[PDB]
């Protein structure tokens, strides 16, 4: 006879993700997808509106004590807080924190924290950093759609001090050309590249003919800041950044000691760094107001400042100011 006896018992595979495990686009590069664009992409992949998916799954995990079905028939602002809203949701705010935590738990993904700036909480001041209204680069969207590439909004577009796309040298457009209104970042249905109000198109060959060199340092520094966070491999330590700033201050002081003229070029930044090192270290520092000009005068990229260790940073500073020190 036949000795083979099959067994059809189930195998009990590990629990699957509640939502699709969509990869974030261009993580670690100056063109990383914003959390808002990722939310809209996940909603589009599920054939659900961002609002509807939000109260379907994120709201019960965010809003702890409510009836989930009764939450299914509300406005997005009840949990997002549209009184604030703004592209600042991409920042380091509390609702951003809990939203990122819930999203990472739902898809068991380990990179959504890089799609925002919670890794820089306590490091970079929130005020004066993010735009109040949605912005886009029409050339980017048109090129992406023509090349059959995924549409999304980079983090750089959410910053006030980023107004130009270095790829296309085009000033960011905050107003829909069709309806004339300015889109909020969060809406009931706002797929990337589309007008959240009139459903019109926002990608056109718009030419940028301004002095982009003025804002080049700011945009490149912010791009480096976004692109560097996923590559660190750890949560940054506040006093690490504080002591790097202090080391740059000491290098500045030694350079001034060697050359008196440099005091004229660096006095204001010296005073600002001294104040930032005398105030509480746990207090965040204003990114564009303090760190970017400081590393600019130090002739050091934001990537070099936040990435290199103390030895490399000290050696490069000494070489940059032609000092004879060796740490």
């Amino acid at each position: 006879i036949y000795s083979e006896h099959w067994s059809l018992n189930p195998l009990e595979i590990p629990q699957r993700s509640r939502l699709f495990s969509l990869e974030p686009v261009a993580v670690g590069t100056p063109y990383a997808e914003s959390l808002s664009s990722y939310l809209h992409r996940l909603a589009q992949a599920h054939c659900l509106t961002s609002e509807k998916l939000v109260m379907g799954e994120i709201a019960p995990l965010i809003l702890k004590d409510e009836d989930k079905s009764e939450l299914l028939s509300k406005n997005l602002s009840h949990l997002l807080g549209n009184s604030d809203a703004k592209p600042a949701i991409n920042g380091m705010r509390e609702m951003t924190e809990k939203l990122v935590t819930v999203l990472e738990e739902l898809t068991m993904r380990q990179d959504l924290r890089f799609l925002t700036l919670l890794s820089w909480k306590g490091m970079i001041y929130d005020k004066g950093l993010f735009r109040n209204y949605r912005a886009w680069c029409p050339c980017c969207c048109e090129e992406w759609m023509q090349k059959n590439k995924t549409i999304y909004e980079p983090l750089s577009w959410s910053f006030k001090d980023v107004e130009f796309c270095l790829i296309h040298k085009q000033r960011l457009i905050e107003e829909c050309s069709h309806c004339g209104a300015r889109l909020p970042v969060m809406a009931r249905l706002s797929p990337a590249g589309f007008c959240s109000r009139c459903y019109g198109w926002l990608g056109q060959e718009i030419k940028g003919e301004e002095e982009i060199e003025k804002y080049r340092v700011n945009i490149q520094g912010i791009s480096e800041l976004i692109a560097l966070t996923p590559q660190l491999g750890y949560k940054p330590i506040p006093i690490e950044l504080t002591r790097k700033l202090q080391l740059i201050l000491l290098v500045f002081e030694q350079a001034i000691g060697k050359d008196v003229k440099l005091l004229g070029d660096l006095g204001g930044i010296m005073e600002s760094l001294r104040i930032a090192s005398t105030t509480n270290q746990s207090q965040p520092y204003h990114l564009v107001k303090l760190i970017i000009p400081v590393c600019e005068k130090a002739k050091i990229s934001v990537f070099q400042l936040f990435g290199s260790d103390f030895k490399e940073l000290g050696k490069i500073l000494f070489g940059n100011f032609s000092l004879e020190l060796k740490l």
Binding site: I237, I239, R243, F310
Partner: protein, 213 residues
């Protein structure tokens, strides 16, 4: 001698288990990324008055001591000077560090040495002798014994991921080194798990301290 330094930190906080190697190493790596990749670094056992439940009560002389090459201090000083770390749910604080030299002594001692695949005392002595020759060192090997005279083994609990692995080691006392070779021994050490809070060698008085209790 002075070519290597022992970084000392006045450590205060909650009482700590007596097999706290991986706990303190992981906490330090959490608050100091560069510590996770250095090579010639090692940590001295944390002194104090022990308790009945295999825990150590930190005292005024309790301090975290780190052995490091003087050409790598600026990679560790920023992340530990004045810094604080958490071991589980316990808070620990470090003061401004002070530098201590590597002094030679006639006899040395190590609290816990582990070499892979050596559990019996005799083959452990043979392997410590082999590493002893590999360093160009001369001396005699003895194993610290309990009140019973049985060689004393110490155990390190590495709680990697969900599981935890067991590594057992011996206390090794080596005498008649000659000061140059003594310094070479204290700086190299034997066992390799110096980041794991084992392989650092100390003058022989602490051997008496550990043998009394």
């Amino acid at each position: 001698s002075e070519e290597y330094v022992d970084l000392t930190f006045k450590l205060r906080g909650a009482p700590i288990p007596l097999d706290n190697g991986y706990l303190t190493y992981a906490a330090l790596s959490r608050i100091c990324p560069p510590l996770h990749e250095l090579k010639s670094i090692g940590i001295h056992p944390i002194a104090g008055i022990p308790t009945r439940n295999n825990l150590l009560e930190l005292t005024a002389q309790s301090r975290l001591k780190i052995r490091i090459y003087h050409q790598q201090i600026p990679l560790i000083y920023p992340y530990l000077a004045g810094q604080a770390f958490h071991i589980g749910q316990n808070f620990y604080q470090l003061d401004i560090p002070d530098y201590k030299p590597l002094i030679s002594s006639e006899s040395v001692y190590s609290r816990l040495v582990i070499i892979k695949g050596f559990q019996d005392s005799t083959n452990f002595i043979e392997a410590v002798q082999r590493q002893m020759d590999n360093l160009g060192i001369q001396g005699k090997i003895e194993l610290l014994t309990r009140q019973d005279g049985t060689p004393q083994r110490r155990q390190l609990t590495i709680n990697k991921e969900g599981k935890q692995f067991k590594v057992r080691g011996f206390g090794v006392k080596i005498s008649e080194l000659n000061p140059e070779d003594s310094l070479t021994l204290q700086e190299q050490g034997i066992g390799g798990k110096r980041k794991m809070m084992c392989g650092i060698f100390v003058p022989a008085t602490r051997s008496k301290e550990e043998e009394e209790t």
